[PDB]
A paper describes a structure:
An essential structural component of bacterial biofilms is functional amyloid ([name]), which also has great potential as an engineerable nano‐biomaterial. The two most well studied examples are the curli system in Escherichia coli and the fap system in Pseudomonas, in which the major aggregating protein is CsgA and [name], respectively. A fully experimentally based 3.2 Å resolution cryo‐electron microscopy density map of the [name] protein [name] from [name] is presented, which reveals a Greek key‐shaped protofilament. Each [name] monomer consists of three imperfect repeats (IRs), with each repeat forming one cross‐β layer.
Numbering used by the authors:
A (entry chain B), B (entry chain C), C (entry chain A): 45 to 57, 60 to 96, 110 to 122, 125 to 161, 173 to 185, 198 to 234
Write the structure that this text describes.
């Protein structure tokens, strides 16, 4: 049982770059990657072979260039792959994988506004099995993946 | 069982770019991608081989150029492919895949208004099996996909 | 039972570089790495073969270039791999591994603003089993991983 909670938080604004170059190219079984470039993002990965939460209560976001990017990656993979990219302030990410519950809530928040760039370059090229990709560029996006075999 | 909920949220406005270049070109089994460029979008993917929710309660959207795009992608795929693109503020996305329930609700909201650009460049070129694409550019669009084999 | 807590803390601002060159290339069983470059980050690893907390109460962050990077690493691994990279001020990291609970909370905080660079160069190349990667560049990101076999 995992939990990730964020109560009140005052963000006031700046360069934010997050990326993955040629990497995770090959895989077997499960694989999960989450990339974000922001202020209060949340990331979580759960995988297994053979009950989680993510809360984001009141936060004051006030304001900058945000670059969340993913270059060559996850090209030739077998099994499960989950990729989530977001360039915002309060995004939430999650990946659930299995071989042979979930909840993501965002309560009251104050987003006020700045350039946000998401991205997915040459990637996910030859995926056998399962694969899920979520890309967003905003303020309060939410992403989740769920894959299984057997 | 997955869940994605967004209670009250005050969005006040800005550049938002989200895209996927030549990627996901080949696939086997299942594949799902969701791209959005906005404020409070929600993304979820569920796939398997061999009960989900998405709520969006009251949110105050007040206001910027939004660019949600997908260049070359998902060209030669075998099995299931689900792509959802939206350039708005409170869109919701979902992909359900299987080999061998669902609900998406949007309660009260306050959308007030700005350029929104969706897009689907050369993609989905040669898909064998199943494929579904949903493109929208707005404020509160909702997208969902459901594919299966066997 | 582990615990990592941070009460009030006044951070006022500077070069911060943290990286891992060609390393952790091979592995067996479990492996977990966390890299951060900031002010009040928290790191924790828990692995086993055959009840943890992480609190971050009020902290005043006021302000510098932050470089959190990971070059070649985690290439050919068997079993479980968990990598978390963050370039911020109050990020939190955790890795849970097993063969054959969790909570991460961030209470009130004061983030005020500067360049933040995350990164993942050629890595995770050929991972058999489980692997999870979380990359962020911000102020209050939170990362967690959970993998198991058997």
């Amino acid at each position: 049982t995992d939990t990730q909670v964020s109560k009140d938080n005052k963000f006031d604004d700046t360069l934010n770059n997050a990326g993955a170059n040629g990497s995770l190219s090959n895989s077997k079984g499960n694989l999960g990657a989450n990339i974000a470039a922001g202020s209060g993002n949340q990331q979580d990965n759960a995988a297994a072979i053979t009950d989680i939460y993510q809360e984001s209560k009141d936060n004051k976001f006030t304001n900058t260039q945000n670059n969340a990017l993913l270059n060559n990656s996850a090209n030739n993979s077998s099994g499960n792959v989950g990729v989530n990219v977001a360039a915002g302030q309060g995004n939430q990410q999650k990946n659930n994988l299995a071989i042979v519950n979930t909840e993501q809530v965002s309560l009251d928040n104050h987003f006020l506004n700045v350039v946000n760039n998401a991205g997915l370059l040459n990637s996910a090229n030859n995926a056998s099995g399962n694969i899920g990709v979520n890309v967003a560029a905003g303020a309060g996006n939410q992403q989740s993946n769920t894959l299984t075999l057997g």
